[PDB]
Every structure is written in structure tokens, then in C-alpha cells.
């Protein structure tokens with residue numbers, strides 16, 4: 001139970017939900033539980049637009065992060081996605097095959113079982129690929145909590161969508177492109193997984209491969 005309320009730029013948080021789409025029930029720190037739901041895109045009611053969210057100017061190559069409200073208190077992978085808006089980020093619903101992955105981490109095998117780079121984290125950061133073209137993007141941050149993921153319907157998704165306007169961009173062609181919902185299936189080997197009883201040797205975060213450019 002955590003949220004990603006604000007973007008981090010130049011080693012300072014911006015305002016809670018200023019450059020990030022606030023979502024229905026964000027107060028309760030509730031997980032998305034259905035990867036077929038519109039919720040999996042930007043969380044509940046957040047996709048339809050950002051008519052009251054701002055867009056942060058950023059550079060291709062810049063490290064943009066998110067604050068974490070309390071901390072990442074569940075085990076699992078961190079993932080980030082972006083999507084080019086056809087105009088202003090605040091008018092973009094993020095529909096269609098427009099999402100590409102820019103980041104994902106995976107676990108370490110210990111004596112005690114899997115540890116994760118996200119465990120206890122109070123902030124998270126990513127790097128806008130240096131070749132990403134000029135444009136308005138959604139920046140979708142996701143932690144997939146896997147502590148109850150042994151049964152179908154048991155993986156938890158903790159998400160937010162930030163709005164950024166990218167300059168200093170190159171001639172990258174982000175791909176492959178996927179949809180939320182649609183990228184994830186509840187039987188996916190990174191979503192339906194017993195992280196404990198046989199200790200995973202080769203855990204595979206779901207969705208498409210990372211676009212590096």
C-alpha cells in the first residue's frame with residue numbers, strides 16, 4: 001500500500017499530484033488487481049485526461065523520478081513506461097498501442113529468498129532515453145507486488161502517470177508498442193508466480209522488452 005504522487009527533477013520533489021494524474025481512491029493506497037481494467041493504464045479514472053494536471057519540461061537523457069508515499073513495502077519489480085501524446089499530455093487518454101517500456105529491474109537470490117532493488121524505497125528514478133523524440137509523453141511508473149501472486153488475481157499493481165514535455169530529443173523509434181490494458185495477461189510468468197516455495201531462478205518482469213534506443 002503505497003502511491004507515486006509527484007515527479008522528482010534536479011534532486012527536488014515537485015508538488016504532490018501537480019505533474020502526476022491523481023486517481024479515485026489514492027488516499028487509500030489501494031492496488032489495481034485486474035490487468036484487464038482501464039485502471040492498469042494510469043489508475044482509477046486517471047486515464048481519461050489530465051485537465052487538472054501539469055506537464056513538466058524535461059530533456060531526452062534526463063533522470064526523472066517519482067516520490068513514494070511511505071515506501072515500497074511489498075516485494076516485486078519496478079517498471080516504467082512512456083507514450084507519445086499526439087498534442088498536449090493533458091488531452092492524451094493513453095489509448096491504443098502507444099506504450100513502450102523504458103525501465104525494469106529484477107530480483108536477487110539470497111539465503112532468505114528473493115530481495116528486490118525496490119524494497120523499502122522512498123523514491124524511484126528513471127532516465128528518459130537520450131534518443132527519444134521531442135513531444136508530450138505520459139510517464140507510467142509501476143511496482144508489481146508479488147507476495148500474494150501465487151494465485152490468479154493475486155499480483156498487485158501500484159501505478160501513476162506523470163506528464164512531461166521532452167526537448168533536446170534524437171531520432172529514436174520507441175518499440176515495441178503495447179496497450180494498457182492488453183500488455184499484461186493474468187497467467188504471465190512475471191504476474192502469476194510463487195516467489196517463495198520454489199525460489200525463482202530466472203524471474204521475468206511481464207510486458208514487452210525495454211526500449212533503450
Ligand SMILES: *[C@@H]1O[C@H](CO)[C@@H](O)[C@H](O)[C@H]1NC(C)=O
Nearest residue numbers: 062063064103124125126127
Ligand atoms: C537512479 O539514481 C541512482 C543514484 O544516483 C543512479 O545510480 C541510477 O543510475 C539512476 N537510475 C536511472 C534509471 O536513471
Ligand SMILES: [Cu+2]
Nearest residue numbers: 001002031074
Ligand atoms: Cu499493500
